[PDB]
Scaffold this active site. Structure first.
Site, mmCIF file in Angstrom:
data_model
loop_
_atom_site.group_PDB
_atom_site.id
_atom_site.type_symbol
_atom_site.label_atom_id
_atom_site.label_comp_id
_atom_site.label_asym_id
_atom_site.label_seq_id
_atom_site.Cartn_x
_atom_site.Cartn_y
_atom_site.Cartn_z
ATOM 1 N N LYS A 155 43.299 -20.446 -25.265
ATOM 2 C CA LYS A 155 43.120 -19.787 -26.557
ATOM 3 C C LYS A 155 44.056 -18.588 -26.754
ATOM 4 O O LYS A 155 43.774 -17.689 -27.541
ATOM 5 C CB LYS A 155 41.643 -19.375 -26.700
ATOM 6 C CG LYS A 155 40.742 -20.601 -26.714
ATOM 7 C CD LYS A 155 39.263 -20.266 -26.723
ATOM 8 C CE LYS A 155 38.833 -19.644 -25.398
ATOM 9 N NZ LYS A 155 37.359 -19.565 -25.317
ATOM 10 N N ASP A 191 30.661 -20.584 -21.675
ATOM 11 C CA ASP A 191 29.861 -20.434 -22.890
ATOM 12 C C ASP A 191 29.166 -21.723 -23.323
ATOM 13 O O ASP A 191 28.114 -21.697 -23.986
ATOM 14 C CB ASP A 191 30.687 -19.819 -24.039
ATOM 15 C CG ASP A 191 32.002 -20.518 -24.275
ATOM 16 O OD1 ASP A 191 32.474 -21.267 -23.392
ATOM 17 O OD2 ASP A 191 32.583 -20.307 -25.362
HETATM 18 O O1 LIG Z 1 34.879 -21.203 -26.156
HETATM 19 C C1 LIG Z 1 35.097 -22.331 -26.233
HETATM 20 C C2 LIG Z 1 35.956 -22.985 -25.099
HETATM 21 O O2 LIG Z 1 37.342 -22.559 -25.267
HETATM 22 C C3 LIG Z 1 38.299 -23.144 -24.371
HETATM 23 O O3 LIG Z 1 38.274 -24.554 -24.526
HETATM 24 C C4 LIG Z 1 37.999 -22.742 -22.899
HETATM 25 O O4 LIG Z 1 38.796 -23.121 -22.207
HETATM 26 C C5 LIG Z 1 36.510 -23.078 -22.479
HETATM 27 O O5 LIG Z 1 36.222 -22.646 -21.473
HETATM 28 C C6 LIG Z 1 35.429 -22.769 -23.610
HETATM 29 O O6 LIG Z 1 34.448 -23.214 -23.410
#
Ligand SMILES: OC[C@H]1O[C@H](O)[C@H](O)[C@@H](O)[C@@H]1O
Ligand SMILES: COc1ccc2nc(NC(=O)[C@H](CC3CCCC3)c3ccc(S(=O)(=O)N4CCN(C)CC4)cc3)sc2n1
Ligand code: NA
Length: 447
Positions: A155, A191
């Site tokens: 991200k 998360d």
């Molecule tokens: O937050 C949403 C997601 O973002 C990205 O895909 C991360 O890598 C992951 O770990 C998470 O769960």
């Protein structure tokens, strides 16, 4: 090419049911590959064991802290468990500065520790040493429920000295350097996992957690005999799919459009998280921006003239996509967005901008649904019931704030999961509450 038309261009985003089923079956193949010891290292979908098990039989009352760290902000939460169980929470939001997003992990955690220290002061929770659950929204390889090393940022977040490091140790070290308070970090979860646990509290059929926010990912409860990375066949253990990296081995190559290659090429992590780039709020607005630019280069929008703002990356926020699609029909919501971007749009321009947003957001919902269907159909292969009753807990700004994403997504998932009776729970603060809820069970389990 020649003879370009608005409908022809926006139609490139369509995905037929046969396309979704193909994406779904490939996701299931990648999931199996991430779970087996032989192919794990080369798997695009990592299927990371979380060490969160279905077996603990008891829990306990008490005060539990929660830290929820994502790519831009983080919140601290105090959860009070009392008595049937009663759960009451308090929280505070904080935003990570600049001498962080670019700085070291140590600088990052020092600031987080200072914030937690202040939070405890303000609630007079300094005297008592509290347990802390940690939700960390990035790919982590776990060694235990309270030990995991960061594999890589996603991200577009960054902070040196973090990848390859034990994230819990980083938080522990910082709490240490503060030295004005004690705190036991009893668990670190993704998360998706915290979200599934917060919903599981209210509905024990919830065994799938999902996030469609800045990023897109999912976790689910897998049979231990299938988790080859952890010895044992008894019970179930949550698995963090990190499905955002699906396609990173070329599995989605036939579906990728020029707009997708452009977003990837210019991202902070080229060639990585490709499935997530088709869905996540981090990329949705940018995809719509490239589509609008394509339309103007073809002289089909804004009479072929874009604005300075429209021509700068990141200027079309996903928040704008959602607002465009909330328009009642009078174009006011749409105009409010375009005008603020330095555009003098016609009523037709507004309508074209809305159909473009719908094309991109509908594709996101459909791609995302094939992933979830892949997870749910796989799970159903481990149950003897004719109809599997399963609850999916979901959090995330796209799922929660986009006008019609939720319904398109739900419908598509359901069409792909016959013999499955699915209930969707929109989680409220689950990423944060789930960490605290798992801590109570972990504290009880450790006696
Ligand atoms: O937050 C949403 C997601 O973002 C990205 O895909 C991360 O890598 C992951 O770990 C998470 O769960
Ligand atoms: C201490 O080390 C270890 C090792 C393994 C482990 N597994 C754990 N698993 C849990 O905590 C499990 C995981 C669930 C996910 C779906 C299946 C069960 C868990 C069970 C129940 C809940 S809960 O129903 O949310 N809840 C929390 C509050 N207390 C007061 C009542 C019960 C929350 C988490 S804690 C732990 N600690
Ligand atoms: Na196992």
């Amino acid at each position: 090419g020649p003879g370009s038309m608005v409908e022809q261009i926006l139609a490139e985003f369509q995905l037929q049911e046969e396309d979704l089923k193909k994406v779904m079956r490939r996701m299931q193949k990648e999931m199996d590959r991430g779970l087996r010891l032989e192919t794990h290292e080369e798997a695009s979908v990592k299927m990371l064991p979380t060490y969160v098990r279905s077996t603990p039989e008891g829990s306990e009352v008490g005060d539990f802290l929660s830290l929820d760290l994502g790519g831009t902000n983080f919140r601290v939460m105090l959860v009070k468990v009392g008595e049937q169980w009663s759960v009451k929470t308090k929280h505070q939001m904080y935003s990570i500065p600049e001498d962080a997003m670019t700085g070291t992990a140590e600088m990052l955690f020092d600031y987080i520790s200072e914030c937690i220290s202040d939070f405890l002061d303000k609630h007079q929770m300094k005297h008592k040493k509290l347990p802390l659950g940690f939700t960390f929204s990035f790919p982590v390889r776990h060694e235990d429920i309270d030990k995991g090393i960061l594999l890589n940022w996603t991200k577009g977040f960054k902070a040196s000295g973090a990848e390859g490091n034990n994230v819990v140790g980083l938080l522990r070290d910082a709490i240490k350097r503060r030295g004005d308070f004690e705190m036991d970090v009893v668990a670190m979860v993704n998360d998706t996992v915290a979200t599934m646990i917060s919903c599981y509290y209210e509905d024990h059929q919830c065994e799938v957690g999902m996030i469609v926010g800045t990023g897109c990912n999912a976790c689910y409860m897998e049979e231990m005999q299938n988790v080859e990375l952890v010895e044992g066949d008894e019970g179930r253990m949550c698995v963090n799919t990190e499905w955002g990296a699906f396609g990173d081995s070329g599995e989605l190559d036939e579906f990728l459009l020029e707009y997708d290659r452009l977003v990837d090429e210019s991202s902070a992590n080229p060639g990585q998280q490709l499935y997530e780039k088709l869905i996540g709020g981090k990329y949705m607005g940018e995809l719509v921006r490239l589509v609008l630019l394509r339309l103007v280069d073809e002289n089909l929008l804004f009479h072929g003239e874009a604005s300075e703002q429209l021509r700068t990356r990141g200027a079309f926020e996903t928040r704008f996509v959602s607002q465009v699609e909330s328009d009642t029909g009078d174009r006011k919501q749409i105009y409010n967005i375009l005008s603020t971007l330095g555009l003098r749009p016609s009523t037709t321009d507004c309508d074209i901008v809305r159909r473009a947003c719908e094309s991109v957001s509908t594709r996101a919902a459909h791609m995302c649904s094939a992933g979830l269907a892949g997870v749910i159909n796989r799970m159903r292969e481990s149950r003897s019931e004719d109809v599997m009753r399963i609850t999916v807990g979901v959090d995330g700004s796209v799922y929660k704030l986009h006008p019609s994403f939720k319904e398109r997504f739900h419908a598509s998932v359901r069409r792909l999961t016959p013999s499955c009776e699915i209930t969707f729970i929109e989680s409220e603060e689950g990423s944060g509450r789930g960490a605290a809820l798992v801590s109570a069970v972990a504290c009880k389990k450790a006696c």
